[PDB]
Write a protein that binds this ligand. Sequence first.
Ligand SMILES: [Ca+2]
Ligand SMILES: [Ca+2]
Ligand SMILES: [Ca+2]
Ligand SMILES: [Ca+2]
Ligand SMILES: [Ca+2]
Lengths: 163, 164, 169, 169
Amino acid sequence: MNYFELFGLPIQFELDGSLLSSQFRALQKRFHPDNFATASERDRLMAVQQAAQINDAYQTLKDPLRRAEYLLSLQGIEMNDPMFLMEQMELREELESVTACADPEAALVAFDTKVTAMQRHYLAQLQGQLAQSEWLAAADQIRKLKFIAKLKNEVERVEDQLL
Amino acid sequence: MNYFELFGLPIQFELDGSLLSSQFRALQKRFHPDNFATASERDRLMAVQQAAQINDAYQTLKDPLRRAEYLLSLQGIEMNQDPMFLMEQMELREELESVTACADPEAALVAFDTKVTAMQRHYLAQLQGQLAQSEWLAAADQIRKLKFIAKLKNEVERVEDQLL
Amino acid sequence: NYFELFGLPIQFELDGSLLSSQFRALQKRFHPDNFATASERDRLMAVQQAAQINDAYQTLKDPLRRAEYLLSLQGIEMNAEQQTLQDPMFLMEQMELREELESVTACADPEAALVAFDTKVTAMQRHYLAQLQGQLAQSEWLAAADQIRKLKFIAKLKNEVERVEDQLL
Amino acid sequence: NYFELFGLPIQFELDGSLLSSQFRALQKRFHPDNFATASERDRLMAVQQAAQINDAYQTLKDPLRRAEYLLSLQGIEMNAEQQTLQDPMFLMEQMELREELESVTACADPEAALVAFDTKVTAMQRHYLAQLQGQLAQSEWLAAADQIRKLKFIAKLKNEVERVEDQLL
Ligand SMILES: [Ca+2]
Ligand SMILES: [Ca+2]
Ligand SMILES: [Ca+2]
Ligand SMILES: [Ca+2]
Ligand SMILES: [Ca+2]
């Protein structure tokens, strides 16, 4: 079974996060190794495997990027832009400079706002593209969002540093 | 050019981290887009690509896991279980979630963190050993497990931030 | 006087980079290493002076601490608990916000919930700071001492918000 | 008194699991929601009581705050503005420790340096806590009031350590 079936969910990008979280807790509770503590050797090993596949599935569907990437994998598509690159370098630069701005926590909030807006716009574009089976456009959105994700991770670092 | 030759480094797992950071700094300085701001569009775009590859190379080499994985790929190896290892990682994760509900969470976290770090250290030494002896199969196994450990290590640092 | 020490004027309004400039100026002057081979009395005095410059810098750098110090100069010290027990309406507001924070993890799309809460708290902080600044400027030390009071809670709430953010991602 | 509120003896030694779940007892009694439709006087009083319980749990749960509160009961009040400056030898140790912390990024192996430094700081903290717990039992308040200072510095150094850790992680 693929990851979507496992949770009884439709194969699509749009996902009820709370539903996934409920379906996962039911599975995790059911396939928890403690439920097989006295089973035969073979049964315990298969159950930890099943428990592992469930965690994998949940980890993959929980995150939009992995989920989108997974959706592409089901189509048989496996994946490995200069101006976008230069912009990301510029943004990275802007980020390293907020901690010298007059109001660092204000500049950080400002920066965080526009990065979140970018992420939102790419996610929306990704969703529309997956909806109309435009896989390569989708693949392109996925790469860019991986950049934005790292960028977002760096601003949270700054939020912890600055403080 | 591979990532190693790009920094003038020997192809091996053993790496001088400070040297890499200094070599990266010189490259990053040299190929920074500002140095090409008035160049022709063709030169600018090729320069940002070179700058991007340098950043990628640096990121790939500075992390032992990515570095080890890169070494495997240079041999034409690319990878896509160990039920007992799985179970133990589940137990460790379980133990980590209890740290909060301890007498001294701050002390139990420290204890747990040293255990995980020692474990990481042992897997890292094993990985180094088999890479040196071209035991790629065993090396790839070490890499997978270390990816588990890394995530675990990430979870303890999350709990440390909770307790601080 | 901390303000004297940095040659700065006694206000809540602070030239931030000027402070860091004065700080390094003093740092590079009362640097204890300069007295590493001196008499112990001389060396320990350098250390005490260096530590006091440290205290002074921390106090002025942080607006809340800066405002408490300005209050302190007026001979005013506050008992920052029975003073807040004096203001139960705000305590209730504090409770509503904490309740609403625990309510984030219990929606669907709770990440956008934290964003909404984080923006609100920030806006609340911006507001109380502006009120505090205007209050200290007009010398209403009482009406500043409760702004500090509210901002102390705000600082605590932001930490709780970070705790929720660290769990969500 | 805060100790009575939770029905604990007046001492430094404290079971977390008790208190933490004993907190929930007073909390689920004086919860202001029980007075949501009451007179305003009764509601605000409930709010004040719930807040005082909150302040009590916080004060007791933290060892440094607990120790300081114990001193406060003896009529003794702190003052880092002048007490810390009265111990230059320890200030030197503070500066040497910070210096040591700033040097870990400089080594050709910054990861393992921090780990050793972190182990060092943790060892120092556990030592001063042991001494504090020891002093407080023998009513040596000022030997304890001095351990509280060092521990307060230790708390700040740990925050500095995590800042450098976050710079690595
Ligand atoms: Ca954060
Ligand atoms: Ca944030
Ligand atoms: Ca740590
Ligand atoms: Ca941290
Ligand atoms: Ca954080």
